[PDB]
């Protein structure tokens, strides 16, 4: 019965109840994603740290998936600036980083994803792999369909993201897969103050 | 406003899992096919999705789509007209295309997505926008992390997908954000029988 | 809605699902209770430690409420003998001891109590206060009513328990509140080998 | 044997909480009264429980019991015959005594117990066996830990309870397992108006 | 609360135990009762002595009757049973069965009924070392011998070193203060020699 | 995919922008277009120069037309508006509004339509320091002056130090290699004196 569907449905539920209950009081927040593999002496990591700090300076909780690399970097920045640093972890066949103040673990991928969208009001993507891209395209869809509103999307690293963005222009816009505004609405930058200000300005007057 | 609050959200989520697990319980082996909703029937990508549907049914697979128009309908048409099993898992936003034999409509994005991974053993991406991309990188990340196994990923459209693949293959691999096998494992092709035999072979002996 | 009954019922459920799921694989076990206030240099604590070790030597997991004092003592004994030491903690207006290997935290008192009874097959009470006595009388009731069977109850500390046992004889038996066997079935001892053997012997042939 | 397995246990537990929260939703202020089920109507303890029921209703309380015979029936009779609100929360093991105006039957011990703490603001213990003792030390421990507040505890029967109180007061206090106020706070008396006024006073100004 | 927990039923239960005991033991052949500590284990010298005693009693054609429990009650039951003699156990029901060497077992709720059966259906008492349960039967038989309620009822203590201090106190204090007469104590044999014990019994029963 | 994303609709949209622009600006009084970097902030000396330029242009009875964005487009709009002159902004629609000092604003999707409106409805160009958008308009007006498609159309660069290296290259390299004639470059004024700039324009427009 443990692996059968009746228990499963109950377990799924149980995980949604737990998540919603533990995050119910969350203040305004930004979710930051990026590669788990990048090390602490890398420029992207330094930026992630600086991004953490500046978001807290703008009164935002920082939410990440709680792993190492470019999840750690923004948690570290936020925590050491004495803001609220949240890590929403996932059980993988593959542990929360030491800079997560409010740590949650999720068994179900789909429950954890829902949390990011329900308890933050913008996404910033530092450079990453498939996990980062999975989140980026999900939120681009949610914005495009109106399931979330006033939800800024920012990409950090111009060198890094250029190829993807060019392809989405050069091919998806050109072929009518998306509207121009679906890609245009994203900010792509190397400037963290402008990244934060872009978020503040889109959230001004709620 | 109980209708927008958590207790009701939880019951609705449960209701959706239950309805999908019940309806999909008996599913034989299957392939999920993704692609842009906006492409019309006289387009070559559409004609290709009809023929893919047909060949998948000739290989004894059920064909699963998101249930909408365009390149979700094409494979449902192919599969349907070949007298195999055609499935559409819609999202509430419009109705299921008229070539769905087994239809379900989901309100929750994340619930629908789960059902693709649970009730099919391969993903084929026809050209598409952000909804297709979102599904592609979700599966790439499930394969990468071992959460699914023997789960082939095919992209149809060499010209369309080239530039994405080139960015992945050069940005992500070179910066060390994925391993080279993580991208090489997927098939990129315009040859539909080669796509099907790719899938068959990866499922050999189950 | 958070403090209202619909969410509450869902939360209650969620906690039962989580507990049953995490303890489902438990091997045979004994629950040990006792005072949280007793210190590590006290005779009762030494006995609790020795009790831990001997239960593991008889192939039993040791389950406690995970707090300090005479919960810690049996966890320590069991853990340092490389057996399975379980701590089932409770959120109080009042943290698991360092010798808990499998630690769970419960919001609901009634869910945590159910766990002790469902995932152990005997109770041993070291000397304690009201929390210990609450558990002792609950299990005495469950045995008396047949809700659990082959469930040995042992009290440790002859000097300590004498007054209570004498009163339950001198008054509850004499007045017909309970049958003689309801108190007689308990072993009261200072001898830990005999405490363990009493449990082994009552569990022999399942 | 789905009927003894966890999925069904969970649904049954939920069903029981829901049914109790629904039926008890509107409860005015109340006292729970405990005592042995085996004492008959011509006994003085029974006569005392009838008069206690009556006086509780004269003080504008509903009277809550476990719903069975003996010293659970006596207060239901007193309360009932004085035209106040008489409640019985039975346990499945037999039926509710005939003086219950508002009856519910529970299969789960732990669910029933919760409802006493949630839907009454004082416990009175007539002489009883292990079921009474179990409830008494549960409330003692809730009061001690701050989980309930302004929650008076009265024991009726000075002769009957003396020896328990003397053991507590000397063993537990002297060995440092409880503080002296933890036992002094309860009232032990044969005077029923003194018992009621004890409760009224502890609830003064709500 | 219950009829069962009140004097009318208690009197019926009492009667029941006398009846069942008198009925089951009525036909007993000649017999010795052996008492001693329930706590001693099978590897202790006393245990081994108890086994040999049961064996020798049966070679003298006696049934061997005990309290039917463990330790130095089981030992003489073992001895007797394994020599193909009659081994009897009259147990007392206690919180937390008869030992496996008892071949005619009865079980008593009432200590006082059980104690009557030892005096009525055996004709000698032998006390291996023991505690308060043993000392209880000893002083009862001694008072039954002194009052004449039993006649020709030899009493033997085994373990000279174990018993010496009790027997010295009884002589130096009870005799000297006139609480007993000297023959009330001189008539017990105290010895370590089991053949002498059994011979004391045989000889005491002979010429009757 | 959409009618909207195809050439028939594009041609209609193009026509629409010319029509709306020709319609709205048809009545314009005499005007100068000012260009310069969108990136400079309001505390920079160039910004302050831009404000003063707008003020002085309006005192010479010119409307002041800009690209309607921030930085050194907003500065002359501010100058002009706050002197009670006509301040015009012809914006280009870009990912991520007209500046708040624009009092006659239009917004263009098509860069090429917008660039036509600057040439058709102003009679002088002044370029504050700027980047590639600025240099683009400069070399277009210069080519329109050299080809005779506009006449009596003065061109002024502000910031002698900023512009010197461009103007030196144009003389030492384009003239010397015969790519332009020397008057094609000598006819621009380069200066830091805003009254001289405005006087160069006035004088160039006089006696016509
Ligand atoms: Cl798509
Ligand atoms: Cl193709
Ligand atoms: Cl009771
Ligand atoms: Cl009383
Ligand atoms: Cl003894
Ligand atoms: Cl000896
Ligand atoms: Cl001798
Ligand atoms: Cl520019
Ligand atoms: Cl200047
Ligand atoms: Cl000058």
Residue numbers in the entry:
A (entry chain A), C (entry chain A): 42 to 135, 138 to 249
B (entry chain B), D (entry chain B): 41 to 133, 137 to 249
E (entry chain C), F (entry chain C): 40 to 135, 138 to 249
Provide excerpts from the study.
Based on the biochemical and in vivo cytokinin production experiments, we propose that Cg1261 is a novel type of LOG and belongs to type II LOGs (CgLOGII). Comparative analysis of 123 LOG-like proteins also suggested that LOG proteins could be divided into two different types, dimeric type I LOGs and hexameric type II LOGs.
To investigate the function of Cg1261, we determined its crystal structure at a resolution of 1.95 Å and revealed its hexameric oligomerization involving the extended N-terminal region. Interestingly, the electron density maps of the N-terminal region (Met1–His39) were invisible in all three molecules, indicating that this region is highly disordered (hereinafter referred to as disordered N-terminal region, DNR). Molecules I and II form a dimeric structure, which is similar to the dimeric structure of CgLOG. The hexameric structure was formed by oligomerization of three dimeric structures, and the overall shape of the hexamer looked like a trillium flower, in which each petal was made up of a twisted dimer.
